[PDB]
Structures are given as C-alpha cells and as structure tokens.
Design a protein around this ligand. Sequence first.
Ligand SMILES: O=P(O)(O)OC[C@@H](O)[C@@H](O)c1c[nH]c2ccccc12
Ligand SMILES: O=P(O)(O)OC[C@@H](O)[C@@H](O)c1c[nH]c2ccccc12
Ligand SMILES: *Cc1c(COP(=O)(O)O)cnc(C)c1O
Ligand SMILES: *Cc1c(COP(=O)(O)O)cnc(C)c1O
Ligand code: NA
Ligand code: NA
Lengths: 254, 254, 394, 394
Amino acid sequence: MERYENLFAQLNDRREGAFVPFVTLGDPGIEQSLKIIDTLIDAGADALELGVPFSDPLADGPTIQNANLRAFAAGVTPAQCFEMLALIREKHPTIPIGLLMYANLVFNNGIDAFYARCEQVGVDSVLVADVPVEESAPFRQAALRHNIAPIFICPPNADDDLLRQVASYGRGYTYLLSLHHLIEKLKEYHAAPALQGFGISSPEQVSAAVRAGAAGAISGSAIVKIIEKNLASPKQMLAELRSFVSAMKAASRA
Amino acid sequence: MERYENLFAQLNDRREGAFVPFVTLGDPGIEQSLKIIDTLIDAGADALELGVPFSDPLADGPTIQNANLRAFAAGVTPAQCFEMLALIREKHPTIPIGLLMYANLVFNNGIDAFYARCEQVGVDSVLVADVPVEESAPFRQAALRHNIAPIFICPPNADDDLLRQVASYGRGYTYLLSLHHLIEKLKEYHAAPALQGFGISSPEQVSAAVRAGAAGAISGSAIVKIIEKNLASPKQMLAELRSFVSAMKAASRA
Amino acid sequence: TTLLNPYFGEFGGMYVPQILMPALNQLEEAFVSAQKDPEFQAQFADLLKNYAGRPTALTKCQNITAGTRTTLYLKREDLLHGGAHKTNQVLGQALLAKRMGKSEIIAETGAGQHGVASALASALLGLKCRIYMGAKDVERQSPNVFRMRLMGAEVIPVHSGSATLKDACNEALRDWSGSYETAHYMLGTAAGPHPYPTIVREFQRMIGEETKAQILDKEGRLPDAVIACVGGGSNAIGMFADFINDTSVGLIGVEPGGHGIETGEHGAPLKHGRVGIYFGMKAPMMQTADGQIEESYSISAGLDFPSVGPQHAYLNSIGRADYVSITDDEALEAFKTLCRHEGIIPALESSHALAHALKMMREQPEKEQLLVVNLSGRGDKDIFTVHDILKARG
Amino acid sequence: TTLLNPYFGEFGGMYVPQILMPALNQLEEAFVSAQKDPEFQAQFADLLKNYAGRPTALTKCQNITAGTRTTLYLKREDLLHGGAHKTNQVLGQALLAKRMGKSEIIAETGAGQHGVASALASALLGLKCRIYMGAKDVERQSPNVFRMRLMGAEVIPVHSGSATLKDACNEALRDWSGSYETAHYMLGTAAGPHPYPTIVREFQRMIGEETKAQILDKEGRLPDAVIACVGGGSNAIGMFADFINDTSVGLIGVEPGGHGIETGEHGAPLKHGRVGIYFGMKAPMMQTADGQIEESYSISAGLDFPSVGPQHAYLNSIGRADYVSITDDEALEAFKTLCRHEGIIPALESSHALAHALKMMREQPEKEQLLVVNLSGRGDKDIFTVHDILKARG
Ligand SMILES: O=P(O)(O)OC[C@@H](O)[C@@H](O)c1c[nH]c2ccccc12
Ligand SMILES: O=P(O)(O)OC[C@@H](O)[C@@H](O)c1c[nH]c2ccccc12
Ligand SMILES: *Cc1c(COP(=O)(O)O)cnc(C)c1O
Ligand SMILES: *Cc1c(COP(=O)(O)O)cnc(C)c1O
Ligand code: NA
Ligand code: NA
C-alpha cells in the first residue's frame, strides 16, 4: 500500500498522472520478461500491473490470453513468478507493483499464505479479477494483514452502493473500468485514487483520463501487442516498448 | 391334361413310374437350354417341369434361385420362354410339359390370356407356386377353360380337408411334397396321380417313391446343379445330364 | 376358410405356397383370441406405456404456420422408444409369438428401423431374433446393423436378386416355411398375406386413437385432415384407422415421388404402379411391363417397399382416402424447415408427410384448416444423408 | 446481497468479475419472480408435456435382475425430446430469457448434447442462439455440430487453452459480460455461479418428482436408493432433489473413473479432486498442485466437466449423499448388458449409473433392494465409440 500512497503524493506535487503498464510475467520467457519490465521502468512507468499465468483467465481478452499461452509454452509457474517478483523488487525499491490474479491461484495453498508471499517479495497490491466485492472479505482481510492493497474494479454498470463499497474496501488505487461523475463520487467517498483501464492505447487517452480527474491510466493489450508483434526480434521489441511507454508517460505530465 | 392321362396309362401298362426333371427355361442361355431339354428327353425323361424366370421366387431354394439369375443374366423374358415352349412342343408331340410359375407372371396381362397362351404353345399343366388352393379359383378355372391341368402341391402338413380339395381341384398330376397314407388317401379321393418332389437326387429315391404308390418322381435341384457345375463345358454338361437322367429313369422301371 | 376377411375389396388375400397356410391360419386364430383376451390387452398396454413411452405427445407447431390460417399438430411417434412408430406393433407381435408358444423371431428390414425394433422387442421378451437384410442395405446401414447386434439379434445379409428389401422379404418367408412351429415371422408393415395387414393396423391403431382424444381435448373438434407417409402403410393405417368412420376427416397418404413421377425413379406404386400379386398379396406394385418386380426409389431408404398395403389400395379405390406424392427435394425442404422453426429433426420418411401439409398451407394460406401430420420417426439417423446432399450442392 | 443463499455450506458463491454481478442479480430476481408466477409454471408445464414428452416412463428391468433380490427401475430421460434430460432445463431457461426481455442465447457445450438442447429450445421459442464449443470437441462431435446448425444456431469453435469444455465455458462468460442486456447465458449444468446451481436443480426436479409418484404407484413405497451419473450434476440433482428430505432414500452419485482413479486419468473431482475457485464457484476440481485447472477424462465425453456442482459437494460433506466412481470398462459392460437384456441403448454417461447399480446387485445378490437408476440419455450417439473400442479389442 504505502508505495502507492507515496507515488500518488509525489505525482500530485508535480500535477502529474500515473502511467501504469500491464504485462504477463514470463511472457515470452523469464529472461525476456525481466528485460521487458526493466525497459518499461526505464522508459518511465510509474507503477506496474503484473499477471500470473493462469489456465482459465475468463476476464482476459485475446491479446492477454495469448500472453498467458506464451508464458505457459515457456513453462512459467506461479513459483517462478514469485522469484521474478523478488528480483524486480530488489532492483527497484520504490515502484509500486500490483498483481493481476485469478482466485484459484490465491486460494490454492491458502489465502493467507498467498498474501504473506506477496508481502515477502515486496508486492504492493493484488487485484483478484474473479472476486467481486460481494465475495471479497477473506481476500481483502488477508491482504490488509500483510500490508497489501486489495484492488477493486469499478465497472460502468456501477450503482451508488457499489461505489460506496469499492471506496470503503479498496486501497492503493481504484481500478476504474473504461466517467467524470464516477470519479467525483469516488473522491466524495474517499476512495483510493482512480486509475483508468481497458482500451488505453494512445497518448491522448492518458491525457483525457487525467483531465477527467483520474490519477492515471493503465495499459495492457497495447503493450502486450508490441511483444506479440516482435517475438522474432527481442531487441526491436525493447526499442518499441521504450518508445511507446515514453510517449504514454509524457502525456501524463503537466 | 390329356398328355398326362396318356402317359400315366402307358406307364401303368408297363408297371413303370414317371421320371420328371425340372429346369429353368433359358438357363444358362436360350440355345444351351433347348439342348439341355432335348438331352433330358433323349435320356428318358417321361415329362418336363419348366420354370419361367421370375424376379422374386420365394418358393425356390438357392440352386433354383441361381438358375433364375443365370437366365436373367442372359436376358431371358417370359415372351422368349413361350417361344422356347412352342419349339419344344413342335419337336416332341407327346411328352407332357408343365410350367412352374409365380402368380404375378400369370396375373400380369390377364389370367385368361396366360392360359390361352399356354394352350397355344402346347403346355399341358401349370403349377402356380404362390397360389394355395384357397386362392386358386380363378387360376384353376382359366386353366380348365384352355385344357390346361392346374397342378396343386400336397405338402407334409396336409389335413383331410386339404387332401379332398387337392383331389377335387387338381388335374394331370398331384405334386406330392417330400407318405404311404397320403398316397392312399389321394387315391381314395380319385386325385390326379401323385408325383413326389423335393430333394429327389438319387436312383433309390425314385424306386422308393414308386414302391410307396406314387406314379413317379420329380427332380430339379439335382439336375440344375449339374448345369451349375459345368457352365465352362457345355459338352460335359450334356454328357453328365444324360448319365443322371438315364440312371434316374432306369430306377422307375419294373 | 378364415375367421376374418382376407380382402379389402379386390386387394389382399393369402398368396403364399400351400406349406405356409397353416402358419397363417394359426396366427389369425391366435390374433383373434388375443384381441378378446383382457390379460393380453393389459400386458400390451403395460409395455406400450411403461417401456415404449405411450401416449406420445401431440405437438402444436405455431412457428411453421405463422401468417396462414392453417393450424398444424404433429403426432410425436419420433418420441417412441426406438425413435419410430415401428415399436408399437413389434411389441404386439412379440406378445403374440409368446402366446403361440414360439421362442424365435424372424424379421425382414430395409433401412433397418424395423430390424432394430424387432431386436429390441425380442431382447425385452426373451425371444431369439434373426433378421434378414439385403446386402446392399446392410452396406448402407452399418449403424442400424450394429444396434441389432448389440441387442443380441442375428443379422443375415441377403445376396439374392437386387439384394434389397424385397429380397429380404423373400428370404424371410423361405425360412418361416420350414420353422413356423417354433418361430414367428414379425412382418414390418401393413402388407403381405392375411392376417398381417389386419394385425399390423390393429397393433398401430393407438396412433389414431390417441390423436383423436388429444385433438378433441385441445381443439374441441376433429381434424380436417390427417396426413401420413406411405412406404408399406403401417404408420399411415395406424393414424387413419380410428378416423375411417369419421366421414368429415380427410385421410391423406403420401408416397415418395423420388426424382419425380415422370422420371420413373420413385416409390409411388399406389398411384403410379400396376396391380400385381407378390409377397403374399394382390396390391399395386412397382413392376416391369412383363411383370417382374422392381425397386422403389426415394431419398428416404424407409419408403423403399415396392408395393403398398392392400387396405390403402382399397381406401383409395372407394375414395375414402386420397394419396399423393412428394419429391426428394420437397421432403428435404420440409426436413430443414421443421428443424429450424420447431427444433424437431424429423425422419426423412415423415418429412414427406410434413411436406404435403406445408403445400396445403402454402398453396392456400387463407384456407382455415386443422391438420395433423403423423411424425412417424426422428431424423437423427438422416443427418449424414442430409449433410452430404447439402454438401454436394453447396 | 441476494434473494437466495448462494452457498451450499462452504461450496458455491458468485466468483465472477464485478461486471457480471448485475446479470446474475437480474437473473436471480427473474427466477424468483417466475417461480411464484402461475402463468410461467403453466407455460413451462405445457412445453414439457406437449413438446418434450413428459412425464417420462419409469421402466422395471426384470431381465437384468433375474436371480437376485434387487428390483431395478430406470427413469427414462432417454425418451425425452432430444434424447437426454438436458431438454428440461433449457426450456425453463429459455422461458426465463423471454421473461427478462432477452432475444439472444449464449450456450457452452462439450459432447454437444446441451448445445443441441439449447439450439432446439431457441428454435422453438424464437431466440437467436450462439454456441461455444472447444475446437477439439467440435472435431469430435460433427453430428451434434451439424444438428445445432440445422436448428439455426451459430456454433463458435474455441481454440484458447485446452480447446475443450472448460475453455468454451470461459468464452461463454467473456461474451455475456458484454451482451447480457439482450442475451441470456444458458449454462448447461448445476454448476457455475449462483443462481445457476439453484435454477438448474429447480428446472430438473421434475425427474425426481415423477420418479417418486411413479414408484409409489407401482411399488407402494420409496426406493432404497436412487442412482445417477455426475458430470456437472444436473441429472443427478434433478433426480435427488425431491428425495432429500426422505431420509430413508439413499442418494448415490457416480463420477467417471476413466482408466482408474489410481491412473490419474479420470473425471472424479468430488471424491478425488481438491476444492478450488473457478467458473464462478468454490467447488472440488481437477487441478495441478499449483492450482491450474485440468481436464476430466472419461470414455464418455459427456462426463468431462472438470468440477462438480456445489450442492453435490455439500450433500457429500454432510453425508446425505454418497459418491462413487465407475471405470470406462465397467460403463461399457453396463452399456452392453442393457442393450442385450432390456433392448435399451443407454448413453455412456448414464451407463456409469447403471454399472454401479449392477455392482450393488451382483456384490450382494440376496440383499433385497429397490433401486432407481436415472437413465439420463439414449446411447444412439455412442454406437461408433462402442463399435471402435470393441473392434480394437476384437
Ligand atoms: O488490455 P487493456 O484493454 O489495456 O486493459 C488492461 C487489462 O488488460 C489489464 O489491467 C488486465 C489484464 N487482465 C485483467 C483482468 C481483469 C481486469 C483487468 C485486467
Ligand atoms: O429342387 P428339388 O428339391 O429336386 O425339388 C423340385 C423343385 O425344385 C421344383 O419342382 C420346383 C422349382 N420351383 C418350385 C416352386 C414350388 C414347388 C416346386 C418347385
Ligand atoms: C419404416 C418407416 C416408415 C415406412 O413404413 P410404413 O409401414 O409405411 O409406416 C415410415 N416412417 C418411419 C420412421 C419408418 O421407420
Ligand atoms: C451432459 C450429460 C450428462 C452429464 O451432465 P450432468 O449435468 O451431470 O447431468 C449426463 N447424461 C447425459 C445424457 C448428458 O447429456
Ligand atoms: Na411402397
Ligand atoms: Na465433473
């Protein structure tokens, strides 16, 4: 949690939005993934959202589905993902790191153990994609016990009761699914700062999100497409990732 | 009819049984069939039973079924069969000639017309295999109008009412299906003389039939097998037919 | 003599070799006895209800008739155990066999539905079943052949003649001639020698009886017409029988028109054949000018009987029932229409009946009429046939 | 909050992305409304009776049990329109869709029976149907794919993941997320997120209700046990539900043991899996030590759901129902036995239930017991599978 607080305070002092890339850990392999992540950070990522490959990701679109499949082709396991996370943290002490998880991988060897492992490697937040607020109690409780922010999605079809619950239960940031009024209401209820996600692929969308009152924007498919499109040239891949992240981050600045 | 009467009177004066071969007309072709028939007569056949090839002969066993199929392979039609019959009669004025028919071929162009055609070519009798006594009225009436003997089968499962009907309705000969008492009862009722048929393939069966009080014996499959077995040598075929008929006829003599 | 009339007008009779007459008289006698025997009726009813699934539904098809004044019901013999109406009368005939002390069953089959039906009834009732099938049909009907064998029936290919249904019919008779003391011949349609046309009708007549009760319940009146396909005549006579004396009810039988009557490649002997004598009966048949029996052609293997039951020929002659034909393409169109509009996959046999009802509706869409189509079987079996044709045309 | 309890003990819940919650609440609401609405009940009853063919027979199998003190009845869901019990609840769910003002249907299918069922219901009721099926299953199930298409459904192959049922399940949810305003997701078993396990049970419970009435009529008492196969749990919970409060009635669910539990190649998560969270629910599943979801193996494609309905997991936990497994070879033997002794060709799914009843009988042949096996479907579809295996062994 604390890393997000520090980030948003720092960004607010610079009248600046957060730009937050998503990638799947171990796509297209462990080594290339570690390099990808270092490149995202060097290019100006303010935080990271990181997917752990799961067999049945029913909230992931085709682009992300294929990232998981590439990661699985490389033999990537949750255990290897946690080793990756420890090293990323050891390299980069302040950048917030969030995980995008599916419930079974969290519940598998015990909800408590999962969040304890997150805390040990230096993860800051966890969004469990198939756990709605209604089912979230054990997850959010375990997360808070281990100083991990539980992240909730605030979708379009969101009514006032849901806004209030998301505001009360969430920490770190609110995942605002792709909105001015939603943003005002979340602020009114003292919700965690909003990051807009879903379909963010161009600089103007980042500036738009910040203008609308969001604290930043998350981009996944756009980033993962660059990986998909450049599998044959790892060097070209990094270059294009650098270019894209730098442009997206620049759009967040005052 | 009259030809049978004359035959049986002649054979009775010589204390002799009739031997009566069956073949399918046009098996294995028209020419070879005419030769077969002339050979049967020369070898000592007392009368002939002649099948007209029919598509669905449900009283014929496999041997006869295959004779029909050979005849059909040669394109043999009922019309060609009647041309054959006229010529056989023109060659052999006294030998009784009986047809083995299926009902549809008799009924097809009119029952009356069929028996009129039999009379024209010099046929003496007609056994309609799928017409039991119960259905026989129009057939037996038309046959008698054209001086053709209607032949009835007297099977094993024959009760006294049936014996009486067969005796009353039949002429020429009674087809006695393969019996001393049946034979006595038929004689008691003034039935047409009995010819035993079904499974007659050896000289001793002919002598047995005559000893039992039958006026003779009919043999088909045995004869037709000789045809089936010798298709490749028509000359051998005739020789073996001559040998078989001569032996069978000899067994009928006092 | 006989107990019952073997003729329907000029049509019918007992044209079998003399040796088979005792078997036919025995059967007629046992049938007449069974029909008066309340214990037989109770046993047959019990099997029909608790094993076969009677009564079958009468389904109103409202999507098909939209925008017309036709109301169309389907009598759902497709829902009967085994997927066709054939089950009704094999159960009755199997019970008769047991009443006569017979332990064995002989049956003939073409498309294989009657064979499967005979095999299932024999399995249930502890009879030894052997089935004759033309080699050409054995080749075409591996699924049905395999079903018969799973149910313990012996399947015997017939290579004689055209090696199709008529030839199996011949071989079935050949066998019974010699074994009728312990074996019953379970004929598969309302044809052949007396008493079979009568027995088969009486063991299918619940189709029409139920239809009458059901239509009175749901509509408060009788149908304007009842419509059924005609291969040999069993499903049609089973639908028709209870309505014969209801003079206001039209009875419409549909024969296969194949590629078209004018092509000569059809299976419509009643209206386009010639009266002959074959398979134990005097009836209209497919035959050459010379009197040799020929095959019926249809897209549907089940409408391949090259003649028709004598009671249909009689009902036609007196004008009580009307017979029509439907082509392969019309049947195919009706098949596709029922699947898409009602979610019912009909047998291609039954699709001929449906097609004629569809014609009655479409030809005169403001004619108010209440029609019942006998849906004689389900069409799961015809999926490959319909697939391939639709594939061959694109 | 919800109107009904989403849990059966620890099992069940609503583990879906937040965006899907309104769809689930809407559906629950519509269901609760529909269940109190006599016009809905009348309409559903009418379809079940007059279109689907309810009530289904309860058949006493006397040949199978000869020489033992077991009396065995089969509940004949094989006689239902479509050939399986799946038809019951697709009709209910289609009516719900219409009650909610939806014009479109999304369904998932494995072996294809639920897909065919969804397509037929949609055809009848004027809904636009699209069906998701794993590419591996599409390849294996051309006949069922073609049936769906004849009935006007759009069939969509799924290439993601293992390209089997679980992956179709994922893609079906993906779609509904974005289209739930006009489309209803017609889930095919008593599993997934609340309210589906409850809805599916309630729209299958006529199986058990009829069974109770029928067994009381014929035997004057309740069964000692009712036995049903368990893929996802729908036919089994439909049989069980009305007997849950009848403490004397055993409830036995049969999972596929595949090549043997010890081989790891099976489909028995309830007794041999591990509790997880997937497909919207907390339930026993087939999963790696790491928590990745795996496939169920069975000779029967229809028992391939890699988890099980939460109400079964609950009934097991409290000891109200007992769950067992049956191997491929045991199911095959039961299939062959029913065909030969009763003339009924059972689905290979249902053959698992039958096999366990046969074991109960044979193991203890002087134990007096009255058993009902839910015959969830017919096995015409399994003829090729059974043929090839029997051919491969000789
Ligand atoms: O890919 P997009 O359209 O840029 O959206 C980010 C999204 O993919 C990422 O945040 C994410 C990956 N998997 C998820 C599951 C649920 C919610 C969000 C996600
Ligand atoms: O062939 P066999 O067993 O010798 O029997 C003569 C018989 O074939 C012949 O008379 C015949 C041929 N076709 C028939 C039909 C019915 C009665 C008799 C026949
Ligand atoms: C055999 C069959 C027919 C045709 O025979 P009929 O005796 O004329 O009924 C019709 N429908 C089905 C489904 C059949 O199996
Ligand atoms: C699909 C299917 C099953 C298994 O699913 P359940 O939900 O467990 O009933 C069983 N039998 C048949 C015939 C099926 O089609
Ligand atoms: Na016909
Ligand atoms: Na399962």
